Ligand binder design. Structure first.
Ligand SMILES: *[C@@H]1O[C@H](CO)[C@@H](O)[C@H](O)[C@H]1NC(C)=O
Lengths: 50, 50
C-alpha cells in the first residue's frame, strides 16, 4: 500500500492561513489585511521637473 | 499397511504426519511533514535615519 499526499497553500493578504479554515472565514477576514496585488509606476527622472 | 497371513495372523501399521507452518510480516512506515511560513511585514529604515 502506498499513500502520498501533498498540500501546498500560498496566500497574499488576509488572515494567516491554517488548514481547517473555510473560504468564508478567509474572505471575511481580509477587511483589514489588504496587500498590493498589482502596481504601476513611472520612471524616476519623470518626477524631477522644474 | 495391513497384512493377514493364513487368515489367522493379522497385522496393521498406520502412521500419519502433519506439518503446518505460518509466517506473517507486516510493515508500516508513516512520514508526515508540515511546514508553515508567515511573512507579515517588511520593516525598513528610513533613508533619513541618524
Ligand atoms: C490512504 O490510505 C487509505 C488506506 O489506509 C485509503 O483508504 C485512502 O484512500 C488513502 N488516501 C487518503 C487521502 O487517505
Amino acid at each position: 500500500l502506498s499513500n502520498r499526499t501533498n498540500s501546498r497553500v500560498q496566500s497574499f493578504g488576509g488572515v494567516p492561513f491554517y488548514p481547517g479554515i473555510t473560504l468564508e472565514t478567509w474572505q471575511k477576514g481580509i477587511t483589514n489585511h489588504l496587500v498590493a496585488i498589482d502596481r504601476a509606476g513611472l520612471p524616476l527622472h519623470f518626477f524631477i521637473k522644474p | 499397511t495391513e497384512l493377514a497371513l493364513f487368515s489367522r495372523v493379522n497385522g496393521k501399521f498406520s502412521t500419519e504426519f502433519q506439518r503446518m507452518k505460518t509466517l506473517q510480516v507486516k510493515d508500516q512506515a508513516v512520514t508526515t511533514r508540515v511546514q508553515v511560513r508567515n511573512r507579515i511585514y517588511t520593516v525598513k529604515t528610513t533613508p533619513t535615519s541618524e
